[PDB]
Design a protein around this ligand. Structure first.
Ligand SMILES: [Cl-]
Ligand SMILES: [Cl-]
Lengths: 281, 280
């Protein structure tokens, strides 16, 4: 375990990491700086990492317990690794700004994404920094949003109408909804580790801010859903087979382009549980 | 005689009777009228066939009156402006605005008399900045209170609307030069009652300078819609010789431009105001 090559991709978010073989267990010195690079850069990219669901689950396991998605398919024999196999018969549903599974009480602290099969071109994935977004807010707006709570609803990104192909798929949806009722989370979240304040709403699951009026909420979310799309808060990644992406899901949102069908695209994701999102001034 | 005050709603507007505005009001009557205006923000008196001289007499009791440099004045009364709209002078007040907030001391109020009216149309509406403010959630009240917003003459007088004649266009330039943008509190504390009121208007407010440009666009977009809520308004259907008196410090008004080709003649007295300020 020497020293990983960390190349920032921007001033506020993103970095490429080289010198870490993810197919084989990482030493402690390496896993530590990989961990810190993720916290520091919010999202890191490692190319040429032909890992299997096995080792991917293993790597994620080291960050903590893994979440099992209520609707997405999982890899054979490895229930924690969801398979994102998109094509004509399963159109991509991630071309919207979202933070992974914020519909549970303890949203994932992070995730590891592996590019298995990719289209000739397209399918880029973008990440936006809730930290940079928060920093870009004027003091009056930071004060306004801090302490407010917003509702997150699993159904916003998982509409029932999208799961009625087969009765099985529909049943899977029913069980998912029953187990994931709408819940509240701070609009401004204090990172549990770094202490940095970050915007913590995402168009994918955030339905409304409950501490203001309905029109006030729509006005704020309208602003926020646009605010986070500022180029300066982002890093855009063009995928290559066997790429690996690891991000801190506590302070970022990502968006996956849906510009490749009829071509097929297969991604594998390990999802690391986090703790209860909170805000501390 | 004691004036009769009939509220037109729970937050704004009242119709008054028992006040002969063609003659001097007793001090008790005037105190009642003045307080009614303060309380209801805009009051209406019907069947007041007054002369401009009489309108000015009444207005002067509220404070210094404006002598408009451009608009024609009634008979031999420089303080009473003649607002004559028709095809050759199309109504242009059908937008939510608070009178002349682009200057340092916007008018405190005005007294408008209906001289000659179209068979129908031309309704004027007022919206309560106080009610609008109080309707805000606590986080929003806290957010806006203390912020400052820029008011710009050019917002209601877009340059693209005064560039017809290569020559007679620098006139627009001359006006803008005398009316530089300036700031006013977003939440204004009424100088007399101490009531807090939203004090932005789509007519002149271009942006809240204490937040980012995009935050400002979102906030003003919200506020310009918020003040249009029916609950915050009073709508008046005019009849000849009506008199409307309003507090321009905590309201915005909108005059429907829906009566052309008919003609509309109003007589107005503008009461000079003081510097708007905010005090928690
Ligand atoms: Cl993806
Ligand atoms: Cl009018």
């Amino acid at each position: 375990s020497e020293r990983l090559s960390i190349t920032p991709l921007g001033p506020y978010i993103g970095a490429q990491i080289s010198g870490a073989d993810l197919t084989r267990p990482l030493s402690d010195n390496q896993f530590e700086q990989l961990y810190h690079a993720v916290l520091r850069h919010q999202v890191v990219f490692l190319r040429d990492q032909a890992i299997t669901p096995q080792q991917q689950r293993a790597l994620a396991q080291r960050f903590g317990e893994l979440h099992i998605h209520p609707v997405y398919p999982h890899a054979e024999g490895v229930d924690e690794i969801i398979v994102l196999d998109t094509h004509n018969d399963n159109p991509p549903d991630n071309d919207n700004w979202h933070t992974d599974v914020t519909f549970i009480e303890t949203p994932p602290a992070g995730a590891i994404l592996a590019a298995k099969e990719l289209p000739s071109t397209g399918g880029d994935t973008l990440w936006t920094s809730g930290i940079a977004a928060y920093e870009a807010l004027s003091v009056p707006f930071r004060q306004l949003l801090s302490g407010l709570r917003a509702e997150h609803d699993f159904r916003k990104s998982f509409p029932e109408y999208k799961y009625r192909k087969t009765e099985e798929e529909h049943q899977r949806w029913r069980e998912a909804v029953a187990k994931n009722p709408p819940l509240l989370h701070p609009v401004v979240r204090t990172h549990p580790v770094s202490g940095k304040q970050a915007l913590f709403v995402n168009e994918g699951f955030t339905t409304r801010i409950v501490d203001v009026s309905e029109k006030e909420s729509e006005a704020l979310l309208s602003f926020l859903f646009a605010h986070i799309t500022k180029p300066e808060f982002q890093v855009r990644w063009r995928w290559q087979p066997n790429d690996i992406a690891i991000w801190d899901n506590r302070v970022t949102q990502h968006y996956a382009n849906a510009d490749y069908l009829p071509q097929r695209r297969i991604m594998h994701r390990a999802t690391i549980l986090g703790d209860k999102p909170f805000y501390r001034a």
